[PDB]
């Protein structure tokens, strides 16, 4: 009886944390940037199996499927710009003048029709052609008219392809055979530490890649309470990925009615300009209902005292400073890249104690620098008609302040930057494990 | 092997975001490059080779 | 100061270069070795 012998068991449930290559599984109209048509057709009715009595230690900050998704999205955003036009012939002395039609004094001097010379079909003839550019794309040359595109001092851009659409489509990240994706189905999970109820899944849920700056949009809400997460909340050099439990609806619009006009800059390649603005010109904006925004700020400030003391003055401020894509709620809304000024949402002071909206004014650019690279820009072609999108503000990306002397006041000013936090607000539940079958265990038997 | 001049780069911009690293100036006096092979230990290895040849 | 061994082995060639703007030119110079430049019209 005591004479135990080794036995092997193949196909035994045991895993170890690992890193692999995951593949997208979006479902299978104009193609989009995330090429969610070379993805394995989504397996429906996925087999989420509840794993009982198991307690796995998660971590959303040293996770690696959020470092993999980022490089996937980058290398997948670049591959959709190779076939598209390269706007090198456009770097030329323009001659801009303010648009002459009814312009509200807020949008005064934000558009200019710059008339330049362009190469024809024939490498020897020139054509005097004009277009409409935004003030954030032209830069004056000789301050003593005569503007020039903003990026003729660094890399030249590759105009996107008008057939390709930037609309984010849900992507399911699958794990290859022999691996498993463990999700932490648990309500009050602050991001690290053990998770007393884990489950197995083959493909993560729809993670639509949106690229916002300081307000996570169209995300997935928390289950019961506004969950605040950070690496070490006591540190003031790590962002604080707040996540709401009820969405704050934000209405962003661009009220001008543009009109495209394709200009031919070479043999069989066109540059889609903006010929005319029909009507009167009016500033873009976004509306966030003041009631349901102040209420969610109250919820957040209540959950921010569980980490900072109940008698703590928590006040918000507007962004600190820097580039336009970090001090401003940048995003894209139907193919037009807005840069909104959130200094109206983040302005309040909280102490331990209708039907109006908060119109934040947005700017618009066409020369964009995604992922903050040096030698890469990208002209976004114009979009015709009034643009209007209705989003959900799901989370924030706050940053504490290094206020010393233990002052009872704490300022939280928003801040974006690396896009990784956008995914990390969705890939916090998941971790990828490597199944290690073939265990060895002793029992009372002997091979003949 | 040595090159005794002291060059000085100077990047020239030839297009949109792409540079051409030129040579702006030579500081000092200009002197020919060269290499030194010790004549004793080179003639000796030539002797070895000619013996094996 | 050039040692007569290295005499005529370097030359500062000053050309016109395209600027940021496809229409403006800049008079810029550099230093090339004699094994990179080739005279054009033997009659600078």
């Amino acid at each position, epitope marked *: 009886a005591e004479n135990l012998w080794v036995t092997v068991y193949y196909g035994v449930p045991v895993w170890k944390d690992a890193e692999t290559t995951l593949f997208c599984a979006s479902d299978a109209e104009k193609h989009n940037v995330w090429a969610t048509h070379a993805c394995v057709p989504t397996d429906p009715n996925p087999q989420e199996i509840h794993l009982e009595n198991v307690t796995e230690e998660f971590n959303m900050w040293k996770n690696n499927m959020v470092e993999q998704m980022h490089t996937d999205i980058i290398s997948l955003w670049d591959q959709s710009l190779k076939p598209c036009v390269k706007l090198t012939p456009l770097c030329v002395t323009l001659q801009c003048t303010n648009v002459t039609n009814n312009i509200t004094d807020d949008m005064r001097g934000e558009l200019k029709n710059c008339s330049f010379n362009m190469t024809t079909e024939l490498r020897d003839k020139k054509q005097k052609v004009y277009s409409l550019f935004y003030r954030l794309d032209v830069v004056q040359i000789n301050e003593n008219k005569e503007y020039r595109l903003i990026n003729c*001092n*660094t890399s030249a851009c590759t105009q996107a392809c008008p057939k390709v659409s930037f609309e984010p489509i849900p992507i399911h990240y699958c794990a290859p055979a022999g691996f498993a994706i463990l999700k932490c189905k648990d309500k009050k999970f602050n991001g690290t530490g053990p998770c007393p109820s884990v489950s197995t899944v083959q493909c993560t849920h729809g993670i639509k890649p949106v690229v916002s700056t300081q307000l996570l949009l169209n995300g997935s809400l928390a289950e019961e309470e506004v969950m605040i997460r950070s690496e070490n909340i006591t540190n003031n050099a790590k962002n604080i990925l707040v996540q709401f439990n009820t969405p704050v609806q934000i209405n962003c619009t661009r009220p001008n009615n543009n009109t495209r006009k394709s200009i031919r800059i070479g043999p069989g390649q066109a540059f889609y300009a903006t010929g005319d603005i029909i009507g009167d010109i009016r500033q873009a904006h976004c509306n966030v209902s003041k009631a349901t925004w102040n209420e969610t700020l109250g919820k957040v400030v209540k959950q921010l005292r569980k980490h900072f003391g109940n008698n703590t003055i928590i006040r918000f401020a507007n962004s600190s400073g820097g580039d336009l894509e970090v001090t401003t709620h940048s995003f894209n809304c139907g193919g037009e890249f807005f840069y909104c000024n959130t200094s109206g949402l983040f302005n309040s002071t909280w102490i331990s104690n209708s039907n109006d909206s908060i119109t934040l004014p947005c700017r618009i650019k066409q020369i964009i620098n995604m992922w*903050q*690279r*040096i030698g890469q820009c990208m002209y976004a072609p114009p979009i015709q008609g009034v643009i209007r999108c209705v989003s959900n503000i799901t989370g924030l990306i706050l940053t504490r302040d290094g206020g010393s002397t233990n002052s009872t006041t704490e300022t939280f000013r928003p801040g974006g930057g690396d896009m990784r936090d956008n995914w990390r607000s969705e890939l916090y539940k998941y971790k990828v494990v490597k199944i290690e079958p073939l265990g060895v265990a002793p029992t009372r038997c002997k091979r003949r | 092997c040595t090159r005794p001049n002291n*060059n*000085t*780069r*100077k*990047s*020239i*911009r030839i297009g949109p975001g792409q*540079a051409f*690293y*030129a040579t*702006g100036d030579i*500081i000092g006096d200009i002197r020919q490059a060269h290499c030194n092979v010790s004549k004793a230990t080179w003639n000796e290895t030539l002797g070895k080779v000619v013996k094996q040849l | 100061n050039i040692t007569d061994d290295m005499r005529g082995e370097l030359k500062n060639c000053s050309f016109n*270069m395209t*600027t*940021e703007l496809r229409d403006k030119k*800049q008079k*810029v110079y550099s230093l090339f070795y004699r094994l990179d430049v080739v005279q054009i019209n033997e009659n600078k």
Partner: nanobody
Amino acid sequence: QLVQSGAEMKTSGSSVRVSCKDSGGFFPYAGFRWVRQAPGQGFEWMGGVIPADGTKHYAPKFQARMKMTVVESSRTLYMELRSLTSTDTATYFCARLQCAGFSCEMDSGPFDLWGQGTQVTVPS
């Protein structure tokens, strides 16, 4: 223009990290220098970094104390001075070598573009 971090105050032994962000490009084209100015007496060479080839060149004095890095994403130079002292109080500048049009010096020129300064005071 180059813009630096705000004036700071540290303790004798702590490490100070200055920063220098250049709005306007010039990162892969020119070579930058780190120069500190003791109160009311001249300048003092302290480093130099060409971010095109990534070559750093520390002064012999501040060879073991400091280290400077580059971040191409945000286009920022950092200079972290580790072993502070009562005599390291100075205004810290980041400069840029001369650029004559579109051809920028990378190795040796006169500094033509300066930063505003970062007054680091360390009393002890």
